[PDB]
Structure formats: structure tokens, C-alpha cells
Structure 1
Amino acid sequence: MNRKVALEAVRVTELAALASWSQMGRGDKIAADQAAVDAMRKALNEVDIDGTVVIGEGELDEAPMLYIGEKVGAGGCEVDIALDPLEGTTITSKGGANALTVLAMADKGGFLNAPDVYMQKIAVGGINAPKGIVDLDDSVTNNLKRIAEFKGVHMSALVVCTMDRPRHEHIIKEARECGARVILINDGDVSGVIATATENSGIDVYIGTGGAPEGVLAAAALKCLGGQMQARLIFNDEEEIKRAHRLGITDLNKKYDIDDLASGDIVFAATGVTDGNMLQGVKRVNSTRRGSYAVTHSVVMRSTTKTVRHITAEHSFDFKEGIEKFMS
């Protein structure tokens, strides 16, 4: 996997984010997701890889573009790709927090090829955090005690993040009961998980259930940033079990370590769409010296080098023209 592909992936997430931003707060989820899918597919087909989507918009049944198995790329090293063209159920359409475009790449077989089902997740940051510090089968209380001990802080210092959902009431109650502070995001548990390993995020732990593709993407990031994570797939009906069986998953209650989610040489890239607790959103800027432009804020990382690059890009644009020109 050539060292060039890392920086080429940022451009993909950037184009996808600018497309999404044209639809931000337009109250049309479908238009936002389609802008992002279109931009991200068109841009991947300019990347020099022999890519196979292993995590994408769905099965070829359901999704015309970026479907499982889709081959993408102009040609190059053989890589498996994990994609989230636009993170968020409604975030972008309402202008909510933590909207993101996400892309990861691994050597063939480097990702758990997750169906879109729910996944329980627990994650903590820290390059020196040891395996076993978090376990999904331990109580919230014991995981938090171990985290607090390793970080050297009183329990009330710890900021636990989870999604505002009824399914998380118990996590919330138990964490508050043992003294921690528990903040709630409305969506976007890729940002929520990775925040545990980002400087100055104000987030120490992530506990919650969210999308499985998002779990894998976040594990990719933390593979690069340092941290520990445990996840478990959840199945609501028999068709989800069939999807897993077709992907090779038969131990349905397997606990995946972070190394089982993403292994080997990993590249992870994301661009912000709206402001979130990982990356800021796209912004319109006017400057006399340099004119008007959109600003995107992105991050690309690589597990083998451990290199992390934060990127602020200025894309020239005459904002007298319609914003949908940012679509591809």
C-alpha cells in the first residue's frame, strides 16, 4: 500500500464534505446523502488503487453506488475500503453537530466486514492504555474505575460520552451513580468514539450502541491514535443474521477487540461537515487579500507510520453563485 494513498484519501473526504455542505440545513436527508455518495464515488474513481468496498452504503440490492463488493479506483495496490460518505441520520439536513465524511483503507482483509446492524461499543483513548482496560461484559462501574485509575484522576473528573437515546439510560444512570459526568450527543458516534483519543476534546470514555460500520471506522482511527475499544454486533431480526452469515460471521455474540475490527496497515481520513467534537464544519470565508473560499477541516492518519495530519483547506469559490455548485 503506497505511501501516496494516505494524502489522496483526504481529497475524497473533502469533496464529499463540500457536496454535503451544499445540502446542510436543507431539510432533505436524501439529497444530502446522495450528494455525498456521488462526490465520494466520483473522487474515489480518481484514486490509484484496486479498491473493493467492504463497508459501504449497502448491498447491491439496496444501493446503486458504493455497495458491498463494488470495485473502485483508477488502478493500483489492492485494498479494502470502508466508507461512510456522510455520517449522520439527520445531522446534515438539520445542521446538527458531528456530521462527517469518512474513509478508511486497509490491506485485503484488514477490516471486519460488518453488515449494517447495531454494535455495542466501549472505547477509551491513550497510547499506553492496556488491553483489557475496557470490557463490554464488565459493568460500567468497573470499566470506569479502571479508566480513572489508569488516568490518575478522581471519578468525577471523567467525561463519559454516549448518544441521547433511551437505550442508553442505564449507561447514563450507572455512570452518574458512580460519580462521573455523562454528556450526550445527538448523533455521530464516530466523532464520539474518536474524541476519546483526540487532544482537548473534553471526552474521556465512549459507551453506547450505534452503527457497526461506524464502529469499524472508529477502531481504524484509534488504531492510529492509540486507544482500546471493544465491540459486539447486535441482531434484531433473522435477515440481519443472514447478512452476517453471508459475510462469514457465525459467532454472533463475539466480542471484537480493536485489533479484530481493523488490523494491519490502516489509513483513516475524515472531513468535517458540521462542527463536532472531532473536527470543525465547513465554513464560508471572505478575505480581501485572498478572496472568498470554503474552508474544510480534515484529518488523515496511518497506523504503520502513526503519522497524524490535520489539514485546513481553502477552496476558492464565488459565493454569488449557487452553493450547489459544490456538488460533483
Structure 2
Amino acid sequence: KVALEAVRVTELAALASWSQMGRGDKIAADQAAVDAMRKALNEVDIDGTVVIGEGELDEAPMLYIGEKVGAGGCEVDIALDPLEGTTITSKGGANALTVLAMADKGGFLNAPDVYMQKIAVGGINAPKGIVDLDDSVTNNLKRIAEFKGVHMSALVVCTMDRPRHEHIIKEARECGARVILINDGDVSGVIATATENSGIDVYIGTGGAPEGVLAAAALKCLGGQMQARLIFNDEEEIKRAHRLGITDLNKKYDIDDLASGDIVFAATGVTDGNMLQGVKRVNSTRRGSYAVTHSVVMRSTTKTVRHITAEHSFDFKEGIEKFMS
């Protein structure tokens, strides 16, 4: 229907964000991104409504939860991060993306801005029940080593550099695994388990709830397993979840529970990461100077995956500011 057109949205949000890469301005980065994604997303033939975005109305003037978007077409619910990794992008760190998923009405978990435990593994073969948040780290990786046909010492486990991950990092290591640390970007790091050239076999750790819904949306189209659990340390978070319909607070959600039906997923890299290469300036002797975006588009029914590298003309003698929409 609309699948291949969403990638223009992510591409322009990543050009805008790339304008603010290395500037150290989390707010200019996130605003150039929201600006440009909203501007491009009001031009796709959809009757879309932002199920997940930059927050509730009062806080976010643009791409707030509930906002009507799209120019006219099939009725869909929209999940987005105009820029996943505003801090990353502001520093020039790895694993920053612009991300956008779409489903038939009510297909995404209606997730509050709250932490979420995660375990993910890639593979179309026959994984499921392979991965379970209520089981040991050792048992999950023992199963995964069996499924992949490797020694435990070959598995590469990704998680975020935090204190809250210390125990998983220790258990996975004495269990025999290799555990690598990303500063930030667990969307990139979850999807990297099902991304053909990452060096990452498993992702374990806790991070945003929306990041986890968007990553599950990708693993639906790539093929994988993933469990998630929302978590709380604050009655304000519990009321926040109560106000979204969520009553079963310790529910383990599987990939189907997080994204269901005809999902389409699209991302663009802003900086080099686990999953996508970053945006680059190129000057050829042929067509002159241009900017290069690396994008992916994926669909859950057909399961076609498309890797797209786009060349965008730019003089580069006036500021990168003109990449901002």
C-alpha cells in the first residue's frame, strides 16, 4: 500500500538530525527531527494516528499521543521516534536512528514512557519459548547456543552500559558468554540480533517501553523471538500505566503481544551503529557532492526486506542547516 513511502519520512528525519549531529544540543536535535518527520509524515496517503511518539499532548506540541496524521488513505496506527538517541546524535555516538512503524488499528502495545525488561534473539528457524524473562540468564543462553549450533563462548550478548545490567553481565560471562556494551540505543541493539552482519547473537537488558515496542515491530518482519516486561519503581508510573488500559502490571509480553497484524517498519541511520550505517557526505567526479542515507523497509505479511542507500544532492558550501525541514 504505503510501505516503500515511509522510508522518505525516516530519511528526512535523519538528514535533519544529521544537521545537529555533534552539536551537543539534544533539544535542537530532537526538534529538527520531530519537525522534519512530522512535515514528511503529513504527505503519505494514510489516515494515520500517532499511537507512540514524543509524549502526551500537554508536553509535546508535535507527534503527541493521539495526533491525527497522514493525507488520506487506509486507516492505521503510527509508532515513531523522530530520533532514537538524541543524546547519541548530540555527541556523535553510535546507534542513532530515525524510526517509524505502522499497523492496522490497535496493533501496537499502548505503552507508557516507563522502563521495560527485554530479551531478544534473531532467527526464522523455530525459536519460541526459547527465550523467557522468568528463566535464568544461563538457561536462556544455553537454549540459544543449542538453537544456533555454537559453543557458548561464541555467543555475543549485547546490553547497555549501566549499573542495572551488572548482574546479567556477570552471569552471562561466568556462564561462558561474551558480553559487549553499547552506551545507548537498544532499538538498534535488539534489531541487531536479526540483522545479517551485526556481530550480536542476543540482546538482554532494560530500557524504554516505546523503544521495545518499535524493536518488536522490526523483529516481527525480520524473524525472531522477544519477551518484554514493563517495570515500575514509582506509583506515578503505575497510575501512568493504569491510564493507558494496562492493568496486568507484571505481564510478560511476547512479540505478537507487542506488535500484531500487518506491520510495516522503516528506519534510517543517523550515525554508524549496530544495525545501519550513518549519513555520509560524498563528493564524486560525476554527479558532484551528495549526502548518503542508509535505510531499511520491512513488512510482516510478505516479509520482504529492502535495504536502500539514497544519494541526496547538496552543495555543502552553505550550512548543513538546509537539511532541516
TM bucket (normalised to shorter chain) is over 0.9
Quick check: 1:129–1:228 contact (8 Å CA) kept in 2? no
Contact 1:117 1:234 in 2 (8 A): yes
Q: Give the TM-score, by structure 1 length.
A: 0.98
Partner secondary structure for residue 288 of structure 1:
coil
1:93, distance to aligned residue in structure 2 (A): 0.4
Q: Matches of 1:170 and 1:68 in 2, distance apart?
A: 35
- Cα displacement (A) at 1:246: 1.6
- The answer (yes or no) to whether the contact 1:39–1:327 under 8 Å persists in 2 is yes
Structure 1 residues 128-163: Cα deviation after superposition (integer angstroms, max 9, x where no partner): 242100000001000000000011110000000000
Is 1:308 paired with 2:305?
Answer: yes
Instruction: Find 1:157's aligned residue among 140, 154, 157.
Output: 154
What does residue range 200-239 of structure 1 map to in structure 2 within 5 Å? 200-239=197-236
TM-score by length of 2: 0.99
SS in 2 for 1:119: strand
Deviations 1:68-99 (A, max 9, x none): 10111111111000001101141000000001
Aligned match for 2:40, one of 23, 43, 53: 43
Cα distance in 2 for partners of 1:60, 1:238 equals 22
* SS state at 1:321 partner: coil
Structure 2 SS opposite 1:217? helix
Cα distance per residue 1:7-38 (max 9 Å; x no partner): 11000000000000000000100000000000
Provide Cα deviations, 1:91-111, integer angstroms capped at 9, x if missing partner: 000000001000000000111
Note the alpha carbon deviations across 1:31-82, whole angstroms, 9 max, x for none. Answer: 0000000000001000111111111100002111111101111111110000
Please tell me whether the aligned partners of residues 30 and 86 of structure 2 are also in contact (alpha carbons under 8 angstroms).
no
Q: Is the 8 A contact 2:29 2:86 kept in 1?
A: no
Measured after TM superposition, the shift of residue 200 of structure 1 is 1.8
Distance in 2 of aligned mates of 1:105 and 1:240? 26
Among residues 238, 241, 244, which one is paired with 1:244 in the alignment?
Answer: 241
Counterpart CA distance in 2 for 1:200 and 1:116 is 31
% identical aligned pairs: 100
Match of 1:52 among 24, 49, 53: 49
- SS state at 1:81 partner: strand
Contact 2:113 2:210 in 1 (8 A): yes
C-alpha distance after superposition, 1:176-205 (max 9, x if no partner): 010000000010000100000011211000
* Aligned pair partner of 2:87 in 90, 93, 101: 90
Deviation digits for residues 253-277 of structure 1 (CA, Å, limit 9, x no counterpart): 1000010000100000000000001
Q: Distance in 1 between matches of 2:295 and 2:248?
A: 36
Picking from 8, 13, 29, the partner of 1:11 is 8
CA distance in 2, matches of 1:235, 1:34: 29
Alignment: residue pair count: 325
Contact kept in structure 2, 1:80 and 1:109, CA below 8 Å: yes
Q: How many angstroms apart in 2 are the aligned matches of 1:129 and 1:25?
A: 42
| Residue pair 1:36, 1:85 contacting (<8 A) in 2 also | yes
> Aligned-pair distance for 1:247?
1.1
Report the alpha carbon displacement of residue 239 of structure 1 after superposing the two structures with TM. Answer: 2.1
SS in 1 for 2:100: strand
SS where residue 90 of structure 1 aligns?
A: helix
Equivalent residue runs for 1:49-128 within 5 Å: 49-128=46-125
Asked if 1 retains the 8 angstrom alpha-carbon contact of 2:10 and 2:98, the reply is yes
Distance 2:274 2:251 in 1: 30
Which of structure 1's runs of 4+ aligned residues deviate more than 6 A? none
Distance 2:126 2:208 in 1: 24
124-133 or 248-257: which moved more?
124-133
Asked if structure 1 preserves the Cα contact closer than 8 Å seen for 2:44 and 2:70, the reply is yes
CA distance in 1, matches of 2:25, 2:31: 10
Shift of 1:237: 1.6
Contact 1:51 1:72 in 2 (8 A): yes
RMSD value, Cα: 0.7
Matched position secondary structure for 1:260: helix
Which 5+ residue runs of structure 2 have no aligned equivalent? none
Q: Give, in whole Å, the separation in 2 of the partners of 1:189 and 1:209.
A: 9
Unaligned runs of 5+ in 1: none
